[PDB]
Amino acid sequence: VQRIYLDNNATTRIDPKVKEIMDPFLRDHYGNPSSLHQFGTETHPAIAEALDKLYKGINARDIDDVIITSCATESNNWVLKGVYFDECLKKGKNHIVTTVAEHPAVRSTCNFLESLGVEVTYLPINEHGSITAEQVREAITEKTALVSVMWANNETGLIFPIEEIGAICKEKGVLFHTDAVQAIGKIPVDVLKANADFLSFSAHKFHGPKGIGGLYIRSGVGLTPLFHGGEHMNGRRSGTLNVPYIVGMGEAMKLAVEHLDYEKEVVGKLRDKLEEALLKIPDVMVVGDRIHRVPNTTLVSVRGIEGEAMLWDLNRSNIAASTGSAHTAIRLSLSRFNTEAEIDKTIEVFSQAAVR
Amino acid sequence: VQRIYLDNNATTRIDPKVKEIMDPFLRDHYGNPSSLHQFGTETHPAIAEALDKLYKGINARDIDDVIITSCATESNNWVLKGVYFDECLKKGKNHIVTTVAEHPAVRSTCNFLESLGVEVTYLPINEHGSITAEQVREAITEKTALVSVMWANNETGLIFPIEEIGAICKEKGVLFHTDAVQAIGKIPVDVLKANADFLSFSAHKFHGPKGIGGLYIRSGVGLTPLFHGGEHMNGRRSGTLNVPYIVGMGEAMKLAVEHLDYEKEVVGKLRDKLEEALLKIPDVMVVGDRIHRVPNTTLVSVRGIEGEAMLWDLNRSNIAASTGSAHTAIRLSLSRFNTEAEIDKTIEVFSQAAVR
Ligand SMILES: Cc1ncc(COP(=O)(O)O)c(/C=N/[C@H](C(=O)O)C(C)(C)S)c1O
Ligand SMILES: Cc1ncc(COP(=O)(O)O)c(/C=N/[C@H](C(=O)O)C(C)(C)S)c1O
Numbered sequence: 285v286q287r288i289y290l291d292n293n294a295t296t297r298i299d300p301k302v303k304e305i306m307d308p309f310l311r312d313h314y315g316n317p318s319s320l321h322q323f324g325t326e327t328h329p330a331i332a333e334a335l336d337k338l339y340k341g342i343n344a345r346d347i348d349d350v351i352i353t354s355c356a357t358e359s360n361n362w363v364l365k366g367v368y369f370d371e372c373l374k375k376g377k378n379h380i381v382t383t384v385a386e387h388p389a390v391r392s393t394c395n396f397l398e399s400l401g402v403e404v405t406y407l408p409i410n411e412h413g414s415i416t417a418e419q420v421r422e423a424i425t426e427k428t429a430l431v432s433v434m435w436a437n438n439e440t441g442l443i444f445p446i447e448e449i450g451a452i453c454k455e456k457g458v459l460f461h462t463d464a465v466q467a468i469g470k471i472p473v474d475v476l477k478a479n480a481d482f483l484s485f486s487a488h489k490f491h492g493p494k495g496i497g498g499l500y501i502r503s504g505v506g507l508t509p510l511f512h513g514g515e516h517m518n519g520r521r522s523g524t525l526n527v528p529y530i531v532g533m534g535e536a537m538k539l540a541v542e543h544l545d546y547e548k549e550v551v552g553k554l555r556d557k558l559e560e561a562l563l564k565i566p567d568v569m570v571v572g573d574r575i576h577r578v579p580n581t582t583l584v585s586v587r588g589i590e591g592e593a594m595l596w597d598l599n600r601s602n603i604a605a606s607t608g609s610a611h612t613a614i615r616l617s618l619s620r621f622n623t624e625a626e627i628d629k630t631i632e633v634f635s636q637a638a639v640r
Numbered sequence: 641v642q643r644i645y646l647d648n649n650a651t652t653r654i655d656p657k658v659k660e661i662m663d664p665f666l667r668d669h670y671g672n673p674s675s676l677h678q679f680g681t682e683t684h685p686a687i688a689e690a691l692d693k694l695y696k697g698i699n700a701r702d703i704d705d706v707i708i709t710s711c712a713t714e715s716n717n718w719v720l721k722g723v724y725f726d727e728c729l730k731k732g733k734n735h736i737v738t739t740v741a742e743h744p745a746v747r748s749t750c751n752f753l754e755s756l757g758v759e760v761t762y763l764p765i766n767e768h769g770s771i772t773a774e775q776v777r778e779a780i781t782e783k784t785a786l787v788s789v790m791w792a793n794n795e796t797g798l799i800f801p802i803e804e805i806g807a808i809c810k811e812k813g814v815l816f817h818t819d820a821v822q823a824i825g826k827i828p829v830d831v832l833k834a835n836a837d838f839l840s841f842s843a844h845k846f847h848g849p850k851g852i853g854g855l856y857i858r859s860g861v862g863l864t865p866l867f868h869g870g871e872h873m874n875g876r877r878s879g880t881l882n883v884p885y886i887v888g889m890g891e892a893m894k895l896a897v898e899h900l901d902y903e904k905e906v907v908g909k910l911r912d913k914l915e916e917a918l919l920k921i922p923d924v925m926v927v928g929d930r931i932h933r934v935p936n937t938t939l940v941s942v943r944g945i946e947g948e949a950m951l952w953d954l955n956r957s958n959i960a961a962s963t964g965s966a967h968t969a970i971r972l973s974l975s976r977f978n979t980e981a982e983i984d985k986t987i988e989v990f991s992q993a994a995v996r
């Protein structure tokens with residue numbers, strides 16, 4: 285069998301250099317970074333270079349934290365539950381603004397915050413398929429604790445106006461969090477440009493293992509731990525370090541940014557080649573704006589064919605894709621690993637499956 | 641160089657069968673278990689057998705959860721913060737009882753719960769080096785939400801009276817949590833015998849990777865998520881599955897129990913061989929009871945030599961050990977991998993370092 289992988293917004297294959305760089309921490313360099321003996325101290329240099337690559341990747345500065353969590357889900361839960369006690373209960377600012385595009389755990393966590401009496405404004409998504417920065421302006425009551433807006437949407441591919449929201453946030457003096465999880469590797473990420481207080485990512489969406497992610501925290505800005513115990517990550521997230529994954533995510537991050545041009549030049553081009561052809565066949569439209577999108581994603585609907593049905597069929601010809609809602613549409617999410625071969629084939633296999 | 645590893649209460653070497661069983665999930669079986677296509681569905685059987693081994697290892701029953709977390713630290717934070725909203729705020733039972741032996745994150749989390757007005761009784765540790773079940777009895781105000789007692793202590797090796805506390809808890813109708821993290825692999829664990837509502841473990845203390853652990857939850861008993869998003873682990877802990885680690889921890893668990901006799905027969909014997917000799921040289925006593933201890937741990941003090949100083953020196957001769965308080969003492973924590981060779985050598989190297 286020869287399968288075609290087109291589900292990268294949902295997870296990605298660990299890069300071989302990533303797989304390789306981790307291996308020695310699964311073999312012989314197994315000690316606890318916290319221990320003082322040689323087995324501990326050995327791990328130090330490689331953790332440090334890993335972390336370096338992480339800050340380097342998002343343009344964090346030496347005085348900021350990028351804390352290693354066990355996934356973006358953890359990161360996001362930690363921001364929202366954190367600013368709840370720090371700013372909603374204690375500073376009394378009982379409002380958080382966010383969007384409806386936000387992945388479940390963000391929405392879901394907010395939901396639970398309402399259950400404890402938080403006022404949460406869930407910004408509606410427009411016909412262009414986006415949010416506009418001006419919308420965010422409109423919703424910041426000065427008793428607002430936090431704005432949270434995803435950097436790009438995992439369905440549409442659609443990049444939101446993050447740098448602008450950073451401004452609005454700076455100006456209005458409110459805390460800014462962006463879930464960047466579908467931006468890393470797809471387009472450049474600059475926390476500095478973003479006036480982000482808080483930024484989230486998950487390793488597995490840029491060719492690292494599943495089971496690790498990060499939260500960037502701006503220097504000075506504070507966030508009551510979601511994992512108390514305070515023994516690791518300057519006390520901000522206790523619990524023993526996942527050395528292998530950290531070292532991996534480091535490399536993953538590094539490589540992800542190095543391929544940033546290739547993502548735009550080649551992967552985006554492969555996305556347009558796929559999207560062109562598909563769009564040509566009868567009553568098949570792309571959901572949302574086609575202009576401000578991460579390079580690798582396209583979300584198509586075929587009038588009359590349920591998306592769940594299209595996916596089932598595609599699976600049978602060994603092509604892996606997912607569903608985004610619009611009823612439901614097909615989510616085709618490329619990586620640096622797809623070639624034109626696989627694209628051509630996909631267009632063939634799509635079309636034939638369509639008419640049936 | 642030929643190094644001797646004696647720090648297993650602080651982390652352990654990933655077993656080669658563990659390392660091996662994971663490898664294909666880092667190579668080619670990389671899909672998201674949640675996806676519906678083949679890349680997702682492939683992972684299913686191996687996750688299932690992994691989970692099987694986990695329940696099998698702690699004697700959980702089909703109707704209980706064993707939820708995959710990203711470490712015991714996560715597990716413990718989740719129990720304590722969970723029962724806080726479920727039983728302290730909502731059912732109004734504003735008391736949690738626990739011990740002073742409990743690892744940091746447990747104590748530390750409780751600490752934060754006091755900051756929100758929880759009444760927490762931190763049971764003192766006796767001269768025998770333990771807790772007595774009767775102590776727990778004494779402290780259960782009927783407005784008590786939870787008792788939390790570690791199964792064995794990570795310093796002394798000392799097993800606490802867990803089955804008895806299970807009784808006391810059942811009788812008094814209060815919620816029971818045991819942090820078992822230093823029991824798995826060292827002695828048999830039975831959640832059933834323990835009338836445990838909640839049980840914690842971390843993979844890396846029994847030859848799995850760091851970065852994964854579990855929380856056992858009894859059927860019916862509920863626990864507001866610490867990771868909202870509700871997409872995974874019957875909604876109880878959202879966030880994408882760390883397939884490799886799960887599959888690994890599975891094997892790790894399996895093997896850990898299979899070696900349970902060998903732990904008692906051989907590793908305990910190696911511990912006594914080491915402990916005997918060390919104890920013989922001038923003014924060196926073992927901290928706490930020597931009788932109800934996990935087989936692999938010994939915690940010695942040498943009057944007049946600081947422990948931190950002994951460790952430094954030992955490190956130089958490529959022997960890795962840690963410190964437990966008593967001022968401070970030496971924590972020597974064996975695994976199934978140590979041989980008599982390494983033990984004899986340790987006694988030599990210890991003694992010589994002592995006189996200096
Ligand atoms: C923007 C964004 N943020 C966080 C996540 C979750 O990553 P993780 O589950 O590994 O912590 C995701 C994962 N998204 C999956 C998807 O694209 O299908 C999910 C929405 C099912 S979690 C995401 O898209
Ligand atoms: C009983 C017990 N429970 C949980 C932990 C923490 O495991 P983890 O950091 O991997 O989540 C530990 C880890 N103990 C380390 C030790 O033995 O030195 C620690 C106390 C530094 S965290 C533990 O002993």
Ligand SMILES: [Cl-]
Pocket residue numbers: 365366508509510
């Ligand atoms: Cl919290």
Ligand SMILES: [Cl-]
Pocket residue numbers: 721722864865866
């Ligand atoms: Cl919570």
